[PDB]
Design a binder for this molecule. Sequence first.
Ligand SMILES: Nc1nc2c(ncn2[C@@H]2O[C@H](COP(=O)(O)OP(=O)(O)OP(=O)(O)O)[C@@H](O)[C@H]2O)c(=O)[nH]1
Ligand SMILES: Nc1ncnc2c1ncn2[C@@H]1O[C@H](COP(=O)(O)OP(=O)(O)CP(=O)(O)O)[C@@H](O)[C@H]1O
Ligand SMILES: Nc1nc2c(ncn2[C@@H]2O[C@H](COP(=O)(O)OP(=O)(O)O)[C@@H](O)[C@H]2O)c(=O)[nH]1
Ligand SMILES: [Ca+2]
Ligand SMILES: [Ca+2]
Ligand SMILES: [Cl-]
Ligand SMILES: [Mg+2]
Ligand SMILES: [Mg+2]
Lengths: 423, 437, 309, 53
Amino acid sequence: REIVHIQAGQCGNQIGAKFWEVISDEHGIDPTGSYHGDSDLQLERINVYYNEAAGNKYVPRAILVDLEPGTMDSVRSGPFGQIFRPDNFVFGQSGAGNNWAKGHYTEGAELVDSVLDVVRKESESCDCLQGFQLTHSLGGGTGSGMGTLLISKIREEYPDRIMNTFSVVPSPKVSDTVVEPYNATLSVHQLVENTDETYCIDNEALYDICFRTLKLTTPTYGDLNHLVSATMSGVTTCLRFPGQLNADLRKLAVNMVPFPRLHFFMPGFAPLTSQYRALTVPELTQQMFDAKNMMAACDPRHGRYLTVAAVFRGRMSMKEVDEQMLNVQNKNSSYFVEWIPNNVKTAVCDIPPRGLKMSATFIGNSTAIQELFKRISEQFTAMFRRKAFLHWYTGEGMDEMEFTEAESNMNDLVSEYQQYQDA
Amino acid sequence: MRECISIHVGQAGVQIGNACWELYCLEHGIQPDGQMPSDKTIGGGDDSFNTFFSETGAGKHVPRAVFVDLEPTVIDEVRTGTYRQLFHPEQLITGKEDAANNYARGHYTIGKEIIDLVLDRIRKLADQCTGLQGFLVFHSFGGGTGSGFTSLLMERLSVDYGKKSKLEFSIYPAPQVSTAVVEPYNSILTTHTTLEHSDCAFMVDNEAIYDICRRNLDIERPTYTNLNRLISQIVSSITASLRFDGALNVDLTEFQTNLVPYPRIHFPLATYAPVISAEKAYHEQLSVAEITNACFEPANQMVKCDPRHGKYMACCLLYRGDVVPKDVNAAIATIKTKRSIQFVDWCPTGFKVGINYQPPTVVPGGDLAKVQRAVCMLSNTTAIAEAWARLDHKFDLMYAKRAFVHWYVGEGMEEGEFSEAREDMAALEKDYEEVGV
Amino acid sequence: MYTFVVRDENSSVYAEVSRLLLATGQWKRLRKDNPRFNLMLGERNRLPFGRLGHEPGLVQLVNYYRGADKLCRKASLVKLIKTSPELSESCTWFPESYVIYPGNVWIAKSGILISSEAHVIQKYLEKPLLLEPGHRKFDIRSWVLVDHLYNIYLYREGVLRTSSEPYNSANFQDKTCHLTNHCIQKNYGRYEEGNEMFFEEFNQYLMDALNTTLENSILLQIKHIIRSCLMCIEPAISTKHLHYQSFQLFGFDFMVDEELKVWLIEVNGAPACAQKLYAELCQGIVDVAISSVFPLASIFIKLHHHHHH
Amino acid sequence: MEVIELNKCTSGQSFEVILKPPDPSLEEIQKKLEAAEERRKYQEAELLKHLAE
Ligand SMILES: Nc1nc2c(ncn2[C@@H]2O[C@H](COP(=O)(O)OP(=O)(O)OP(=O)(O)O)[C@@H](O)[C@H]2O)c(=O)[nH]1
Ligand SMILES: Nc1ncnc2c1ncn2[C@@H]1O[C@H](COP(=O)(O)OP(=O)(O)CP(=O)(O)O)[C@@H](O)[C@H]1O
Ligand SMILES: Nc1nc2c(ncn2[C@@H]2O[C@H](COP(=O)(O)OP(=O)(O)O)[C@@H](O)[C@H]2O)c(=O)[nH]1
Ligand SMILES: [Ca+2]
Ligand SMILES: [Ca+2]
Ligand SMILES: [Cl-]
Ligand SMILES: [Mg+2]
Ligand SMILES: [Mg+2]
């Protein structure tokens, strides 16, 4: 039943806010928290993401966290900013300076308890909490360092609940500082141990989509976040609307994660937008499996699919959907591991997203995701072999050994993905 | 008269249960409020339909049934639906959190905390019976609750009611409507743990029903509602002998006697004809010979497999509607000269035949056309082991890599239970081979 | 693309079928345990027929008829002939034969013994047709393809597998003149290449020596026997209305006696082909058995007869 | 083709046609379930120890 949502740091709170805008519109919830929709399907699983307050008000089960106020002042002024519970805004003043150690060990530690108080108050009133979703980046300090601290503390207090992240992976193409690969390697180490499912949202891929496909010569954070929000709407459709398949976080984990560490998913979306032509079922299906539609910059032809979830939204022929899903599997059979039979599952939901008649969302557990980790690993090493920029971290009490261990664990994750690809 | 208690476990078991009880009400003239104007004994009786329904002093006819699920949403539809007045609230049991497609979570983790409540509620039904025969248990192989909770329950029912027969109606997994990759695991784990506790199990392969719905009912993409209305007709054909006057399969014990001479080999194949679409505006009605001959076609079986390449240990033909023995015997004589019907050497070559004169009832606004005669064949054929082979192969492919095993181990099951279960299935496939080939 | 899997590495016939399909452009070979195939070229032993036809969205075809072994083992064939009323104990074209568990000349087989004293024990045909020059025994191999619709196609080229030794009534110990197998012969090759005489030559011989044709004297009887055998097991093996479909290539072996009466000896369920006829027959298999089910973007006589009575 | 055991009633008939002659105890269940629960407890304590580190 209930999911608790947490958004941390600049990136986490920006994508987080858009997520709540997009799903509040799909469920007919306006910025005051009033329902003004046309269909009982909108309210039937509303409690998964929204609490009900007095006056038939729907309030997101959402906690907003940062070490600086700036992005959270912007959240509060944003279009849906009034819908959040005021007590669920938990902010420090210090900032974290793009420094994972500040987020995880010094500044974040000072604030983490007050975040947990709010987590506990939301959790306490859940009829049957399924677990948590966190939105954050891995390249900064607060979402990366403080976010992974939160995950660890949440696990200690709710060890039998599911932990899910939407984790934005850094790229030099859309880069704020040189230390991003350090912060991401340190964070991946945490995610490998302490999440059950992680959607790898790669800024490399979002940028390439905006540039190559959508023809945006200069992509902003807003253009990248349009892709992120459509993806997030798509991958949570099964949690939010009535349906058979992957209807809660645990069942999704059980279908998607054959070995506990290999829980890093490559999302995709079709059609790609920033337009009037009807998209056919064959076209959605080909495009949702296309490298160019993937939100992690990994070539899926360089690996194999362990498991896949496909979600189609809109009024369309279920027969045609089944036939096309079967067609892609039959013609591309070598890219689906033979030792997990029937490893592709398909859901269809009648309610389309805003501004589209038809859409498809793709969630892949592919061994090609190793490309993402290798790219981060190479950027990490190029610096770390000269100990460049380390004083930012050792000044917060960290040793070099902790960097060596994180790098080694992420190289092990890469070797494991490679083992199942060769099996 | 001797009572039968129906137990419906998990989503599949519950939704099939809804379809079955709806159909039983229509067959017996019981209204959705439970009143039965044709029953002239108010507040009791030992009629044949009382095997499945008790009676209150106010004239309400109450299914002898328990519905159990580990999450509430499917059972809540029964509580709020058309037949809600039919059931006492204590017959409808739900938890808050499901088994997440994991046998171990149904059997060990959640099953340990609801099992005493479920047995208590079953006991309440048993205490109202004057001669309880036993239980009919409806569940999926593939779901966490249908697999794991059912096996726990069956074990406990052998302990608490050791003299009593237990029959199953079991839904075998098909990828066209399946909701989990680990269904082969759950199927083998439940089949292993349940095998000694079940006297007779009717397997329904969702693939076969699905295809019958597409081919014969012209349904483009069958839903559970389509599948379950057809399944409920087959179930009704099988249980009709417990609910109406007759001299064949009149008690649970007789199902085993007539269909299961070898106790582990207790999976009869059901084949049903005719299935004809209600939208079909010109239907030429099918004769006894045609419907009987259709019983030997794989396309009409509840499990796709080829009985020509196994051996029969028993065959029962259950007719409904305008059918007399003379036409049955002439149809059978024709079929013997045309088909590969080979019995094992230690059983006689023969058919037990039951005829009920009332044609099949259908649910108004359903997919099935009303027909003047129908038949369900129940054959214990070794060919059904083809289904075990398919499932066992899928299990082996995943288990060789230990794919998904950590989900089961994290629920406190030992890895050893996997290979113990698999070896019991290897011995089962072997038994079927030794009898059949 | 259509897709296929290869599961018998030693089939000469199906290595060539495989190579033909690939060179079409429109077939892809998959690893042998990938279940997402249109076509199984199966193993000979314990082919998993129970796993076929359970793949949503693939029409699935296999190159063996399940149950055809009844026709294609010596003990099985004798029993099927004696016990099937359409063939019967008094069947005229099969030698008197007896199943035995552990002019009076008999042969024991299932590694072969020929004697007049004392597995199947079968009446040994004492008066074979003998080719001149050389006074020599032979057997006729016919290849027959049964498609998914149960059409029965007789490849128009057969082969005579000859002896190259004179035939000898008073020595059944010496087997090079009594047994016409290709291996048992390898005076080998003397009369013809590899102890194989083909239909154009044998027909010429029947014309010049015996004033008749191959069609009239032998092939009418061959066609009758093949059709009777295969129509007999049809209810047992047909895949019409089944959830997967089958085809199969059979090798029927015949003996011709000196009165030009044809007798059935053997049905082979996994035959090889004469070198010279691989290309043509294997192309025929693709056309008739495979492309018929899986169409892309006659060397056979179809055997059919509906006499009214 | 012998027809035996013909029984007729107003609602139908039955017969037979022959073409040719020829557990664990309560205690054990409880032990298994508590052992599974102990294994889950043990894994949970190991996790919390690692988290305390
Ligand atoms: N025929 C039929 N099959 C069903 C139905 N519902 C689910 N299934 C099948 O049952 C299997 C899934 O098991 P469910 O019964 O839904 O699971 P459950 O017993 O509720 O277990 P959890 O939800 O894991 O606790 C799949 O093979 C489904 O296709 C139904 O109403 N009819
Ligand atoms: N009843 C009989 N009368 C005369 N010759 C016979 C015979 N039975 C067998 N033979 C001879 O023995 C030879 C080989 O016998 P058989 O047919 O049993 O071997 P085989 O199984 O190897 C044929 P294949 O290799 O085509 O399967 C035949 O080609 C034939 O010449
Ligand atoms: N996709 C996306 N990425 C962002 C956004 N804001 C920052 N980033 C990325 O997030 C990383 C920086 O972390 P940020 O979240 O600003 O730091 P924090 O506040 O300390 O967590 C870099 O990799 C940026 O490219 C955003 O709105 N969208
Ligand atoms: Ca401070
Ligand atoms: Ca009464
Ligand atoms: Cl008892
Ligand atoms: Mg920033
Ligand atoms: Mg369920």
